[PDB]
Each structure stands twice: as C-alpha cells, then as structure tokens.
Design a protein around this ligand. Structure first.
Ligand SMILES: CCCCCCCCCCCCC/C=C/[C@H](O)[C@H](N)CO
Lengths: 245, 57, 242, 283, 242, 57, 49, 57
C-alpha cells in the first residue's frame, strides 16, 4: 500500500506503481533563508510557480557494458525554462532540489543501479598517465550541461575515492526485480547562504551500474534511463543584465 | 568577562575549559560532549519503517 | 615573589597535551555561523552506515576491478556447495578493508561490540532459491561440508519480494576488547569464519538467464565502540607531495 | 482578505549517549507475519535488526565509553605540515600558507567536507643534523594584501602592525594560537567550480578548484642580523586543531596523492582497495 | 615552594601579547587631564565623513594634479553617452585610494556593510540637465549603452536648487565579509561597476558657459565594519629617515 | 588599594584589567569599550536637518 | 653583561665608559645579559602638558 | 569534573590526591588506606576453629 506514489509540484505530476520510499537527504526539508542567516540587503525575488516544477532532461541508453554517467547541479537547468532566465539575470540564487530517476524493465531482465547524490564532486585527471603532469579537466568535462558526461574509471569515481563506500552519501537502489524508480530530496548545502549559479556547482548526481544488465536474446535490448528533477524553494537576488557564462 | 570568540559557540562543548587570557579562542579544549544523533544518517526516510513489519508491503 | 621549583617534565613538547596558549589577535571576532545540515558529533554515527563489501578479491580481478563488488551464484548440479568464505576480522586486511568501518577501525586499536552483514539478491524476478549463511566461532578451520557448518550460528535465506537478509554476527569473545588480528601471536584475537552454502539449487525457468549475482553490505550494531587512537598504514608518503 | 490564495519538520533530534547500549534478554519465538530478519536495502536505509531478534541473548550491562570516538579527541593532535630550510640563500624565505603538503594530515581532514576550527601552531627549529647553535630568529605572519619583505633588511621587518615572534634556538619551542579567520562560515576542502567570471579556456584551466576563502597569505622567517649568518637552518611546523565542528562526511581516499592543489592520481597503476587473494572459497 | 613546570611558549616575545610589566617610577602621578573637544572613541566615526573622490585619474594629469578632483560634463550632440566609470572596490588601487575610507581600509583586510557616493553639481545657475547613475552587480563588464546599464540599481538626478544626490551602494554579496579585490584569484571578492550616463542633454542659454564640472564624495553607511588589522603598503621606508 | 595613575582615568575603559604591582600604569590594557559618538563629526550643524525634508528650503 | 640607563632632561650625562654617572643612585636602570630573555619596562605619561 | 579513568576506582584509596589535568590517571598517588583482611589467607577453613578447644576432636 506504499508501493505506489504521486509527487505533484507546479503544474506537473509524477506517478509510479512500483516505488521504494522517499529519501530526505540528512533529514532536512528545503526552506527559505531566514533573517538570522541572511547577509544580502536587497529584497529577494521568488517566482514560486514557474521554477518549482518538474523538468525532464535527456534519455541515456543502458547497454550491456556501460560505465556510468554524472550530472552537475544546477548546471543542468541553467539554459532551460524561466529558471534558465532568472539564473542568467541575477547574481545570487538559493534552491533545493528533488531528483527522480526512472528506468523500467520486464520480469525477465536483471541488473542493479546505484543512484547517489554527492556534494562538492571535484573531478580529477589521470595526470598524464605516468603521473608527472599537472593536468586539469577542461570546461566541457567539468560542466557538461543538460546532456551529462560518462565516466572513465568508475572504480575510483575519477576523483581518487573508491566506489565501495559511496553509500555514506544519501542514496538509493534501482533493482530491476523489485522497483523501477529512485527519488532523493536534497536541501541547500553550502558555506554561504547565497551563491552564483554560473561559477559554482553544488553537488553531482551519479548513476553507476554495479551489477551488469543481462537478458536472454530475443527480449527488448533497448533499456533507457531518464532523469527528472525539480527545484523546491528557489530564491534569487542581485539583478544585473544577462550574462550566460 | 571575556569577549567570546571561539569556533564552537552556538552549539558548544562541556563547561570545563580553562583560560587565563581575555580572548576565548586561547582557551583549552576540555572534555567533550557525549551527544550523538545516528538516525539522520542511518534512517533518512520519510515514511517510518518498523523493525517488525515487512518494509516493502 | 612566591618560591617555586621546576619539576621533571619541564620544556618538553608533548603533542597530545592540552593547555592554554597565547593569542595573536586581540579583540578578533569570527564570522557568525549559519545552520548547515548534516552535522557529525561523533565518529560512531558513520560506522552504522552500510557500505559495500569486496568479497570477490581475486588475483585476476586486478585489471578489471569493477567485478570485485559482486560474486556470482549459478545453477549447480550437485547439492550443498559453498559459494564464498572469508574471515570476520574488520581490522585485518582482506574483504573488510573496503568498508567505511574497516577504514575507521584502522585509526584505532581495540574494538568491541557486534557487527551485521546484509546480503542483497540482484537476479531476475522469476528466479528463486535458498541459501544458508553460517558464522563459526574460532577453533576450527573452514568446514568441509554443509553438515559441519550448520552447527554454528546460521540463518536460512529465501528469495522473494523482500530481497535482503541480515546475518548479525554476535559478540562472543573472552576479553572485553579485541586488538587487530594478524598472523603470529595476535591471532589469539581472531573472531571466526563466515561461510555461505546452497540450501537448495538455484532454479530458473526458460527464457531467464542462469547466472545471478549477490552484493554484500556490512555495518556495525549499536553497542559498537573503539579506543586507543593510532595512525593507519593504508596511506603513505614516499615521494614528496608537489 | 480579498485574495484567498495569499494568506496561506525535523526528523530526529540528538541526545546524549555516555555508554554503549546494553543488551536485554530474549527467548525463542515462533509466529507468522512478523519478520525482522528480512529487510530491503533498496530504500537506502540501513537495517535495524538487533542481536535479540535473531538469536536468544542474555542480559549484559556494558560500561564501554564512547569518548575516544568524538571529533574533538580525534583531531586534537599536533601533526607535521611543513619543512622550511634556509641553506632562501639570502637569510629569508617566504612560504605560502598551504596545509596540504603532507599526506598523513591531509587524509584525516579530507574525511569531512566543511570544517570550522581554531588552531595552535608550534615551531621546532634546529640545524639540518639536529645540532644546536645560539642564534636569534624572527617569524612574521603576513596577511593577504600586505606588502612582503623582499630582502633580509627590508622595511617590512619593522612589524608595526603584523604579529611577530622573536625567539632563540636554545629556547623551548614557540607556541601561538590562531582564531577562525575565513570570510565564509567554514573552511572547505573541495570547491567544484571556478573562482572568477568570464570565459574559461585552456590558459585559465588551472583555476578549477581554487577557493579564495582558504588562501590566508604567507609566512616569513629570517635571521635577525643584517649580515650573512654562517649556519643552515631548518624549521618544522606543527599544528593542533581545537573546537572542532564538521559537516557532511565523505569517502576516504585510497589512491596516493600527487599534488597539493588537485585530486589528480596516477592513471596507470590504479590501486585496488583490498589486498587480493587466490580463491573465493579458501581464505 | 610550589611545584611547577614550564610549558612550550616560554621566553618568546609576542608583539601583540597583552600582559603586566614592571614599572620604573614608584609613586608617580601624571598631569591631570583637561577637557579637549573632539575625542575619538572608535575608528568608525571617521569612516562616515565624506571626502573627495579622485575620478579623473588620467596619465596626463600627473603634472597638474589639481584637475584630478573634478571631471567635466559638456554639451553633447548625441544621446545616451557615458561620462565616467570605475570599480566600486574601496580596497583596490584606483579612485578610492584618495579617501579617508580608502586609507583606513588598507590597515585592515576584511570589510562589510554598504557605502554611499554623493555627487555635487558645480555649474552655473541657468544651466540644467538630468543624469543617470547606475550600479551593476558583478558578472558583466561595463555596459556598452544606456539601455543595458539601466537594469541594475540606478537613480535619476535632476539639477536645480538641491545640488546634491546620494547613490547608495547596497551590500549584495555571497559572503559575510569581503577581502581586498585584486587581479588573479582575489577578484572573486569584486563588488561591481559604477557608471554614469546622460539622461538628457546639458542645456545652457546664451551668455553662460557650455562646460561644467562635477565633484564626487564618498562615505560609508552605519552598518560598516572591519576586522583583521594589517599594515598598509602605501607608505615605505627605503632610505633612512634623517 | 593602588595609587591610581594611568592615562585614562576620567573617562575610562572596561573593568577587566589585571595588575600585580602597586602602580596603576603597570596594568594590562584589557578589553575596550563599545561606546562611540558619530554625530559630532558627521553632523556639526546648529539647526537640525531631517532626512525627509529638503535641507535648503 | 650590559647596562641600560635612562637620563631625564637636566641630569648629567656619562661621557666615558667608567664615568661617575654610571653609579645610578637615582636613575632607573636595568642590568641584563645577552643570553637572557629580552627586558621589559613600563613608562607612565610624563609630559608637562 | 574529570572523566574518571584510573586503575583503582571500584575499591579505591584515600581522598587526598592532587590533579591539575582533566584525566584522572594523571593524578598523584596520595596516602594509602589502612584496611586489611588477614583471615582469607591464614584461616581458609569452612568449620570455624576456636583457639581454646582442641582443633581435631
Ligand atoms: C604568528 C602566527 C603565524 C601563523 C599564522 C597562521 C594563520 C593561517 C591559518 C590557516 C588556517 C587554515 C586555512 C586553510 C587551510 C589550507 O591551507 C587550505 N584549505 C588549502 O586548501
């Protein structure tokens, strides 16, 4: 009786019939910034309907030998919708999020996905192979946009930390024999109450296939993955002309 | 008294710290608190799960 | 003034000593703190979070290390085979070195309390089977067959809707605390052997694949504790950084 | 109220636990429907099965304290952060404050994401073979933006505002206390983004991960006299950490470090996290 | 006597340390104080007094530096020209180095609060006109035209009897404090760009001159504060005094 | 007590100063006062000016 | 071994290393060695105005 | 107070110990107790023997 779920916010609604429970990251709901922690003096703007809604990104293809994908937040939403406009005409933003990942398969397939939200995901290089080069990741790798990039060495997450203890972050599983979706609610986590949206990226969302996808020949060999996200309590301040990046 | 300027003033540690100067960050560490909250890391779940019932029914 | 004497212990620099030092900035005030979610008050809040156990740490899996997190279970022709076995030492090297508990125990020396090991099935929906997970207290080696291994603490697992079972490893030891076990004299602090056996076969219909995998998670119970902080040996610094 | 539209929860609170939790007695149980041994790890919550729900237990009153696992006792130990030598040859060195030069303290501090603390610095100074020679020294802390000394006898050594210590080699080692001095509310060891605006290119690609809330200026020592001293000097700096508050834990690094500013690793020898064995059935 | 030990930190000379020292004149009495007007209790009482801003700091005005305090405004033929622009960093070098606020911020490192900039017209009586003074938060460069610059905070000024207007620069920043901005990594602490535009033309009748001047004054608001005292770099001592 | 001879005795600073000798100028500085008066430097004007009204009418 | 001596205005000054002004019968003076910690004194407000 | 961690806490010695740190094992020894029990080493016998009577009758 808790396997079904419905999330509505804005003018959008997500329904699921085989769903796990809802994960609130660190047990805190997202909220507007109180006066005791505020430092900016200008009155903030709250669009409160046109930015608090479900936005659907692109769709990846799960093969039999896939590595994994990552999206940087809120770089994924900075060119779409009115949230793409308020983040271009202002200097400061502050918002929570609500991530929902869908991937469905039949009763004859098998596989397991590990979804996880990781804050301050700083990428690294392989340092020129032999380890003597002070290499740096380019701008296309660190901030891919709403497409998202693939992983190269997923055992070390391309940052030197192992996959084996990634579950200390808020996380869920998409096991193909029980459920087909995963959902996390993330509050705003930063050292400063407001920040720029074009030079700072708060967290990264990682989808890594631990158990490989396997099926017998003849079944539907096209397994897609689709990510859907929604800001929660977005505020903005510091108006200035449009600067994209 | 002393112009209180430490790192831990909002939610602080035990009251056994020793200080001879006028600034509070010169003080010792003292003994620590025994307070802990595990359930915001081991149970970050909206609907409450009981240990007796099936969790996925 | 007042007569004094200096005792032994004068002018030494003790690194774990706690005292009062002189400040450099009079009248300074820090930045006022804001509420940031996820505050850690104690290191035992991390040790109750399950992480993945690396059971399949073979010598051939060093160039493809993504396979070390899952160990396979297939259709058998015989009965009562064992699928995996490892020691239950969280401090010794081996499968427990990949955990957040196994990396936090390395910064200490003595530990106490009970553990838990959670297994999760990741096969198809039509597949079924039953497994036996046993924990044997020390004194004997790994059991040669199932009818020896069922004498210790054991739990029978059934696949179905609920795809997770927790074998709790209870604290059975002679001393109040245990040091880090090792070959030599410190194997006196060993804690047992955990095996896993086929209760029945792994039965699959036509059209569903015949090989599934099992992931294993490990954590600590609520009566877990540690003491006597030391440094780890997993990290090193031979060449100078930068 | 002309518009009916305009008029219009924490999960768990903390508590003190001085000792580890006791174990209560139990018996066997035969019943249907109730099952604590079966869980579901898919929801991201850890299991809540205790010892008494799987086997029968006795009653054990334990008094094991959890004092050593607090974050205050875990971090309040002085560790080496710098080795500074004066063979540089003009009797003075200017060392930029960066506390990520030695891997043993870098691994402990990178376990958390945000940290807020006050430090305590100690300087142990001798010749490069441990030998002792009577000699007068001066340390000077230079905040970011302040002018720096360019010579052994510059005008910056007058220290009209700067904090400074004068200490000899034969003395006990000097000790100071430093407060929390960041413009933000906490230090962070990871910063995903660029510090500046404008276009990011291959010439400015090294800016990625450099947060100015952690750059604290420089540090300068010199021999006091106006002439050339005839001895080689070597300074070692040790830092303690007091009044610790931390946030948002992270996985620990299992690859060896390469530089002080970025998490780059060696791409050829990816070290496996566990020590490998031969067979899965034989320990 | 009483047993003691000496800790680390012994026999050091800390320049910002506060302690008790021995006196040299026992029983001495000072001259009794009289009431002298104008006592300063705090350095923030000076930072609210306006001083003149040096906007016109060109390279050709180094041999005639009396002209750097006034910048001209003349009759235009076109519409929407800009007359001046500068950064609003009180700590960076440039126009703010000539103020009593800009010289007092150099003795510190981090500052917070809002500013204000007062302009005063010094033309004839028959002359008129309207000016637009805009402040743009960081992220963009100087605006190329008026219709870009009017999006930030802006105030429209009208000449008349009251010949002074105050554009307040409000405190909009992500951090609680700001360090001294500079080219490199510390431009993360930049604060914006202040420009000034012709709203209408500068209209003058016959017999009155066609060129007027504008002086600019700067001060701080009441919520201004500073911390972390350091030395300035504006003064030097290369040669020995006397 | 002590024969009080300091530099600041008529209008003085806070009462947290430490001294072991008999002369008061040997004592420490202590923490300072938070008192300030801005209006004798920013508004030295006989007739009072309100912020709402025109100042020159 | 070193000796410091403060001479007020009007007092005689020493003209040699072994003058009679070094007896310090009234003048405040400190005797301190080079190997010691540095000397410290306190001076009150002493102007006629 | 102090987090009490000594070797003798269950049945302890006299209350004259001096300590300046926060851990109780840093404290001095102090003066000792005068308590003693001889009869569990000189008379470990179930049936009580009186000094007047014959012990083996
Ligand atoms: C006379 C005292 C001289 C000593 C002055 C020490 C003040 C500097 C303390 C810095 C506190 C840590 C700030 C940042 C630490 C790391 O270097 C950065 N996070 C680098 O990532």
């Amino acid at each position: 009786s808790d396997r079904v779920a419905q999330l509505t916010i804005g003018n959008s609604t997500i329904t699921t019939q085989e769903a796990a429970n809802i994960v609130i990251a660190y047990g805190e709901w997202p909220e507007y910034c109180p006066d005791t922690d505020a430092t900016a003096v200008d009155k903030p703007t709250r669009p409160d309907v046109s930015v608090n809604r479900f936005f659907t990104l692109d769709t990846k293809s799960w093969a039999k030998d896939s590595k994994g994908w990552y999206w940087k937040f809120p770089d994924v939403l900075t060119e779409v919708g009115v949230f793409g406009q308020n983040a271009q005409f202002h200097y400061l933003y502050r918002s929570g999020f609500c991530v929902h990942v869908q991937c469905n398969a039949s009763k004859f397939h098998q596989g397991a996905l590990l979804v996880a939200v990781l804050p301050e995901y700083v990428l690294g290089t392989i340092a020129g192979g032999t380890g003597n080069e002070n290499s740096h990741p380019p701008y296309a790798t660190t901030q891919p946009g709403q497409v998202g990039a693939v992983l190269t060495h997923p055992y070390v997450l391309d940052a030197g930390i192992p996959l084996s203890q990634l579950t200390v972050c808020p996380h869920q599983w998409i096991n193909l024999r029980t459920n087909n979706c995963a959902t996390i609610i993330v509050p705003y986590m930063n050292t400063v109450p407001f920040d720029s949206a074009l030079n700072h990226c708060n967290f990264g969302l990682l989808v890594i296939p631990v158990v490989p996808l396997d099926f017998n020949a003849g079944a539907t060999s096209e397994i897609p993955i689709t990510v859907t996200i929604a800001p929660m309590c977005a505020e903005f301040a510091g108006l200035r002309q449009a600067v994209k990046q | 008294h002393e112009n209180s300027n430490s790192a831990s003033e909002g939610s602080t540690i035990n009251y056994t710290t020793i200080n001879y100067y006028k600034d509070a960050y010169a003080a010792s560490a003292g003994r620590q608190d025994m307070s802990q909250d595990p359930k915001k890391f081991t149970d970050p779940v909206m609907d409450v799960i009981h240990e007796m019932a099936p969790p996925l029914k | 003034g007042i007569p004094t004497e200096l005792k032994p212990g004068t002018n030494q620099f003790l690194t774990t000593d706690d005292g009062v030092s002189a400040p450099i900035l009079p009248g300074f005030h820090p930045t006022p703190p804001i509420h940031i979610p996820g505050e850690v008050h104690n290191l035992l809040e991390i040790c109750r979070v399950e992480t993945i156990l690396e059971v399949n740490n073979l010598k051939t899996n060093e160039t493809t290390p993504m396979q070390r997190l899952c160990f396979p279970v297939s259709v058998q022709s015989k009965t009562g085979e064992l699928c995996a076995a490892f020691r239950a030492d969280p401090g010794r090297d081996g499968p427990w070195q990949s955990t957040i508990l196994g990396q936090l125990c390395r910064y200490y020396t003595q530990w106490s309390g009970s553990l838990e090991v959670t297994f999760m099935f990741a096969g198809s929906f039509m597949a079924t089977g039953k497994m036996l997970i046993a924990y044997t207290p020390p004194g004997g080696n790994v059991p040669a067959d199932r009818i020896t291994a069922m004498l210790g603490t054991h739990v029978i697992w059934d696949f179905g809707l609920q795809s997770s079972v927790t074998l709790v490893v209870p604290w059975i030891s002679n001393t109040h605390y245990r040091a880090h076990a090792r070959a030599g004299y410190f194997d006196y602090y060993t804690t047992g052997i955990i095996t896993i056996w086929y209760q029945t076969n792994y039965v699959v219909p036509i059209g569903a694949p015949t090989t599934a995998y099992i992931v294993a998670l490990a954590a600590a119970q609520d009566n877990f504790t540690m003491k006597l902080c030391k440094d780890t040996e997993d990290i090193e610094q031979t060449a100078n950084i930068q | 109220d002309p518009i009916a539209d305009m008029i219009d929860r924490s999960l768990t609170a903390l508590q003190v636990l001085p000792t580890a939790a006791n174990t209560e007695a139990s018996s066997h149980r035969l019943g249907t429907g109730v099952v604590p041994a079966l869980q579901a790890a898919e929801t991201g919550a850890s299991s809540n099965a205790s010892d008494k729900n799987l086997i029968e237990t006795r009653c054990v009153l334990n008094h094991h304290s959890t004092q050593e696992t607090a974050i205050g006792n875990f971090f309040s130990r002085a560790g080496l952060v710098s080795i500074i030598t004066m063979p540089n040859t003009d009797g003075y060195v200017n060392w930029d404050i960066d506390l990520m030069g030695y891997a043993q303290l870098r691994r402990k501090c990178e376990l958390f994401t945000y940290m807020r603390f006050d430090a305590e610095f100690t300087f142990v100074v001798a010749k490069p073979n441990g030998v002792l020679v009577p000699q007068l020294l001066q340390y000077m802390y230079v905040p970011p933006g302040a002018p720096k000394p360019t010579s052994r006898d510059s005008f910056a050594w007058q220290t009209a505002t700067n904090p400074s210590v004068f200490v000899k080699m034969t003395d006990p080692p000097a000790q100071v206390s430093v407060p929390f001095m960041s413009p933000a509310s906490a230090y962070q060891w990871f910063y995903d983004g660029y510090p500046t605006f404008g276009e990011h290119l291959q010439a400015n690609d090294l800016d990625y991960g450099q947060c100015p809330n952690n750059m604290m200026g420089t540090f300068s020592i010199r021999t006091v006299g106006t002439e050339k001293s005839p001895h080689s000097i070597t300074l070692r700096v040790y830092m303690r950490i007091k009044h610790v508050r931390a946030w948002i834990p992270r996985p620990l690094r299992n690859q060896p470090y390469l530089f002080k500013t970025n998490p780059n690793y060696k791409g050829n020898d990816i070290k496996c996290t566990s020590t490998s064995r031969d067979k899965i059935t034989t320990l």
